Design a binder for this molecule. Structure first.
Ligand code: HEM
Ligand SMILES: *[C@@H]1O[C@H](CO)[C@@H](O)[C@H](O)[C@H]1NC(C)=O
Ligand SMILES: *[C@@H]1O[C@H](CO)[C@@H](O)[C@H](O)[C@H]1NC(C)=O
Ligand SMILES: *[C@@H]1O[C@H](CO)[C@@H](O)[C@H](O)[C@H]1NC(C)=O
Ligand SMILES: *[C@@H]1O[C@H](CO)[C@@H](O)[C@H](O)[C@H]1NC(C)=O
Ligand SMILES: *[C@@H]1O[C@H](CO)[C@@H](O)[C@H](O)[C@H]1NC(C)=O
Ligand SMILES: C=Cc1ccccc1
Ligand SMILES: [Cl-]
Ligand SMILES: [Mg+2]
Length: 324
């Protein structure tokens, strides 16, 4: 079952004796998410980077005070498209045999590194998959985050910086990635993720939304909490995303096999249709990976789809691609 919210959601030391940072061992997996990477590298998750959905939800709440609804939606979305539904295991990075025997194609069970399922283009500190690596920390891109922080944040990363950098990354992908895709699920996640460093990597004793560059590097590059790091003082995820969107409002779309060909997609969800993003994710994305599942997979799909729906904002109607 999906874990419930924290019983005590106060700020507290999370870089503590029970959760020390350790370097990677051979075989340890890290991926495109600095939050999950940091939780693995402090032992909030298994240090090898393979975890159950329940482990992930507990870790993001306990270590960072990620809110329960957001934790549930993100975790089960990722698990449905990137995880093994029979073994209940998900890699936070590359595809691995450690998630167990694979389902039939076209399901990939590729981990969070799988491009175009959860992971996608115009990430802040990771390159687009077209350029050869969608998961490793990129120093040039991080230095650009530093530059934007210097220009728009007085040297700190905040929501103003996020609004400018988010747009810059989009414009850079339009100009250079002929396969750039920015629709549906990625269109939503790309905006919310830009708020996370301001909401969740800021020491919770301050919680002022101003992330210093030393802390930013520690999380983004080294998957490491600052010495004496306190988590946020209340549950949150994407609060202030409105600021990021308002800076440079965009329509969902894609380049069409050439640079500088960004073409709006009217069949995409956008922020005016959040229930459509959920419905397409289930009806198109999940269904295409598992078009005619065998009995044990159908059962696992339906269970995880029920859990996914628990993280969907009230107002939306549940959809049932495999029946009830
Ligand atoms: C709850 C489960 C979570 C899952 C399954 C997850 C997964 C992912 C994935 C696959 C990406 C890649 C998107 C991209 O292409 O850029 C991503 C990005 C990101 N995640 Fe998470 N994440 C979760 C929670 C969190 C939390 C709790 C934090 C912070 C405490 C966080 C911080 C970030 C950041 C900053 C990025 C953007 C990295 C960048 O653009 O350079 N995530 N996450
Ligand atoms: C919640 O945890 C904080 C910090 O660890 C502690 O000081 C506080 O008293 C706790 N609240 C309850 C109701 O136990
Ligand atoms: C190119 O875009 C398509 C979806 O539009 C996606 O399936 C494919 O994986 C992308 N490849 C790269 C390398 O970006
Ligand atoms: C990092 O990003 C830059 C800027 O897009 C790119 O040119 C470079 O090849 C990427 N990879 C590395 C390893 O620096
Ligand atoms: C970001 O920092 C700059 C410089 O301190 C400031 O002008 C701006 O109001 C900040 N934005 C937010 C959302 O805190
Ligand atoms: C998803 O499929 C259901 C049928 O199970 C249908 O009612 C709904 O309109 C579909 N939504 C989309 C966006 O395709
Ligand atoms: C940072 C991963 C994630 C989690 C929830 C929404 C968008 C992205
Ligand atoms: Cl919560
Ligand atoms: Mg990416």
């Amino acid at each position: 079952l999906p874990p419930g919210p924290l019983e005590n959601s106060s700020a507290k030391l999370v870089n503590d004796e029970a959760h020390p940072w350790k370097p990677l061992r051979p075989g340890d997996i890290r991926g495109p998410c600095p939050g999950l990477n940091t939780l693995a590298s402090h032992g909030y998750l298994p240090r090898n980077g393979v975890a159950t959905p329940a482990q992930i939800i507990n870790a993001v709440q306990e270590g960072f005070n990620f809110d329960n609804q957001a934790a549930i939606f993100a975790t089960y979305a990722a698990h449905l498209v990137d995880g093994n539904l029979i073994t209940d295991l998900l890699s936070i990075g590359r595809k691995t045999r450690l998630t167990g025997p694979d389902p039939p194609p076209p399901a990939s069970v590729g981990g969070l590194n799988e491009h175009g399922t959860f992971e996608g283009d115009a990430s802040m500190t990771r390159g687009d998959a077209f350029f050869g690596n969608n998961h490793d920390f990129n120093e040039t891109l991080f230095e650009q985050l530093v530059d934007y922080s210097n220009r728009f944040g007085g040297g700190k990363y905040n929501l103003t910086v996020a609004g400018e950098l988010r747009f810059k990354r989009i414009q850079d992908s339009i100009a250079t990635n002929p396969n750039f895709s920015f629709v549906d699920f990625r269109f939503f996640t790309a905006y919310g993720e830009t708020t996370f460093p301001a909401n969740l990597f800021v020491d919770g004793r301050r919680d002022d939304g101003q992330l210093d560059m030393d802390a930013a590097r520690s999380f983004f590059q080294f998957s490491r909490m600052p010495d004496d790091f306190f988590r946020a003082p209340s549950p949150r995820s994407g609060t202030g995303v409105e600021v990021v969107v308002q800076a440079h409002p965009m329509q969902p779309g894609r380049n069409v096999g050439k640079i500088n060909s960004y073409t709006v997609d009217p069949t995409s969800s956008d922020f005016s249709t959040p229930c459509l993003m959920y419905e397409k994710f289930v009806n198109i994305t999940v269904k295409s990976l598992y078009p005619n599942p065998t009995v044990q997979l159908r059962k696992a799909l339906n269970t995880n789809l029920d859990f996914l729906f628990q993280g969907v904002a009230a107002g939306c109607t549940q959809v049932f691609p495999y029946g009830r």
